[PDB]
Amino acid sequence: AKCVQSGDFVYFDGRDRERFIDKKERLSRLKSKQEEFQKEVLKA
Amino acid sequence: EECTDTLLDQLDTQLNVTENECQNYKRCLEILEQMNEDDSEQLQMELKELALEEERLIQELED
Amino acid sequence: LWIRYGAVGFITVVARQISTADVYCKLMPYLDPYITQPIIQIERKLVLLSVLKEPVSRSIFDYALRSKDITSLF
């Protein structure tokens, strides 16, 4: 439960070594880039 | 074990969805940038001509 | 015509629900095969109804849907 609260866990099958917290940060970063493109598209 | 794998699977799907939307915006921006700038002035001149034709047709229809 | 205008109803409601950026980047690509001209003002029911391509002929559409070998036909 301690690993789940801090998000310091990874898939048990080893398919991906990126932690849940790391994936969450990447998802937020990608969402930010998407909005930046969307804004430039809106301006254009 | 199952709950942790299910949580990572859901987060992995969200990441892909964000990447696809980012790719689409990158493509759409490139498409709008590559589409030659349609002459706003040329369309405005054409519109003024069509309005005159309509006004002519309105008078002709009245007649 | 009921289905045809029904589709206009769906596309017009969808076009009003999404952002203008998404309309051009995502909504337009789904509609492009059925529209005669690329108009950005898809949000106006009158505009979309005016830009629709002519529907399939009832004789053609009915004859295809009535075909027993629709898999082979398609």
Curated annotation (Swiss-Prot), chain A:
It is found in: Cytoplasm; Endoplasmic reticulum membrane; Preautophagosomal structure membrane; Cytoplasmic vesicle, Autophagosome membrane. Ubiquitinated via 'Lys-6', 'Lys-11' and 'Lys-63'-linked polyubiquitin chains on multiple lysines by MARCHF7, leading to ATG14 aggregation and loss of interaction with STX17. Disulfide bonds: none annotated. Changing C3A: In Atg14L4C4A; fails to localize to the endoplasmic reticulum. The coiled-coil domain is required for BECN1- and PIK3C3-binding and for autophagy. The final 80 residues in the C-terminus define a minimum required region for autophagosome binding called BATS. Forms homooligomers; homo-oligomerization is essential for the roles in membrane tethering and enhancement of SNARE-mediated fusion. Component of the PI3K (PI3KC3/PI3K-III/class III phosphatidylinositol 3-kinase) complex I (PI3KC3-C1) in which the core composed of the catalytic subunit PIK3C3, the regulatory subunit PIK3R4 and BECN1 is associated with ATG14. PI3KC3-C1 displays a V-shaped architecture with PIK3R4 serving as a bridge between PIK3C3 and the ATG14:BECN1 subcomplex. PI3KC3-C1 can associate with further regulatory subunits. Interacts with PIK3CB. Belongs to the ATG14 family. Required for both basal and inducible autophagy. Determines the localization of the autophagy-specific PI3-kinase complex PI3KC3-C1. Plays a role in autophagosome formation and MAP1LC3/LC3 conjugation to phosphatidylethanolamine. Promotes BECN1 translocation from the trans-Golgi network to autophagosomes. Enhances PIK3C3 activity in a BECN1-dependent manner. Essential for the autophagy-dependent phosphorylation of BECN1. Stimulates the phosphorylation of BECN1, but suppresses the phosphorylation PIK3C3 by AMPK.
Swiss-Prot record, chain B:
The chain holds residues 138 to 200 of 450 of the full protein. It is found in: Mitochondrion. The gene is BECN1. This is Beclin-1-C 37 kDa. It comes from Homo sapiens. Disulfide bonds: none annotated.
Swiss-Prot record, chain C:
Myristoylated. Probably autophosphorylated. Ubiquitously expressed. It is found in: Late endosome; Cytoplasmic vesicle, Autophagosome; Membrane. Belongs to the protein kinase superfamily. Ser/Thr protein kinase family. Component of the PI3K (PI3KC3/PI3K-III/class III phosphatidylinositol 3-kinase) complex the core of which is composed of the catalytic subunit PIK3C3, the regulatory subunit PIK3R4 and BECN1 associating with additional regulatory/auxiliary subunits to form alternative complex forms. Alternative complex forms containing a fourth regulatory subunit in a mutually exclusive manner are PI3K complex I (PI3KC3-C1) containing ATG14, and PI3K complex II (PI3KC3-C2) containing UVRAG. Regulatory subunit of the PI3K complex that mediates formation of phosphatidylinositol 3-phosphate; different complex forms are believed to play a role in multiple membrane trafficking pathways: PI3KC3-C1 is involved in initiation of autophagosomes and PI3KC3-C2 in maturation of autophagosomes and endocytosis. Involved in regulation of degradative endocytic trafficking and cytokinesis, probably in the context of PI3KC3-C2. This is Phosphoinositide 3-kinase regulatory subunit 4. The gene is PIK3R4.
